[PDB]
């Protein structure tokens, strides 16, 4: 139990971490690129709305 827990923390410690300014920028870029096909943001006309 104790030996297994020690190995797990060592395994998780040796990974590559990138800075937050890259992850936030990537999230913002994805949202800006795919905001066009978001029917919940921009309402669709009633002609093309199957529920109304």
């Amino acid at each position: 139990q104790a030996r297994k827990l020690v190995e797990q923390l060592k395994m998780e410690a040796n990974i590559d971490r990138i800075k937050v300014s890259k992850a936030a920028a990537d999230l913002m870029a994805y949202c800006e690129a795919h905001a066009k096909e978001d029917p919940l943001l921009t309402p669709v006309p009633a002609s093309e709305n199957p529920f109304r």
């Binding site: 060592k10 998780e12 410690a13 971490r17 800075k19 937050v20 999230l27 994805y30 919940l40």
Partner: protein, 331 residues
Amino acid sequence: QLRQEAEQLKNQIRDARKACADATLSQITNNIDPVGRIQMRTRRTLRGHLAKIYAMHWGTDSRLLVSASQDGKLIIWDSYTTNKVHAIPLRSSWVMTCAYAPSGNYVACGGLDNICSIYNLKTVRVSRELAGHTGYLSCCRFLDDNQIVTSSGDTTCALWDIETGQQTTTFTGHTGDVMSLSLAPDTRLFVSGACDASAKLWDVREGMCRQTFTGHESDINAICFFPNGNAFATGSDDATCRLFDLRADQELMTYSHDNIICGITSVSFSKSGRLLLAGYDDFNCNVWDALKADRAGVLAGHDNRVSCLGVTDDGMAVATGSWDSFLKIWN
């Protein structure tokens, strides 16, 4: 000796995360325009359940869905024309989860009997029963037509083989009840939120834990992947939601308000990932902004606690269920 080494390593992990925080997500997205105001109205209301509802899953075709209720029924609906298609009675009246196959051929179920049952829609009779868990089932998701991942109250998750009914692999490491899980878009990794206020990222092929996130303070109730696949969100019963990044291995933003003190039962994202929809214990649902952490809408058409919430694959409608035995479609 061994205990000292574990404490020393926990400091090394924390120290590395501090060096990667150039800035916060809030600072970068200050110049982006606000989403504004969002108003939604109920389009359909589904009736027929005799008791309070626990689970709900949309279909891949974005037209059919399934729901489970405490009275012992598993009704498949038609969201467009509001017509019941199937009604499967259950052996056990205590059901806590349900799922719908990607191909639409099967439906899964489970609950307090520690068993997962698979039904054959296009044949409706019981096709398979999976046993081996020592606690109540909490969630289940379909990898494909012949695989399924389940989480239970014995602090373990498993990957099953429906053809032979055997656990291909088992995932261990949590110290509390596992409450929810969610699959990656490519179906190669998944995350689980447990009762020890921690979330873990697993590997289906290898069967090992890779990263652990411990930002919350109480029981974690819901979890959901960002559409990109490089982030996820969680919801606990301390009235807070948090956004975690896999490549940075740390929390990015928190969504909380001073007038909310009730717990959170379910979370979900939008088609583009800009909006975050979360259900609460105060009988209504709130809509957040993922990049700015501010409220944008309220869905307050239910009379009892909201227990489930889902968004279609094409992102046209949002379905919610509650304890008053009614489903509603919001568009």
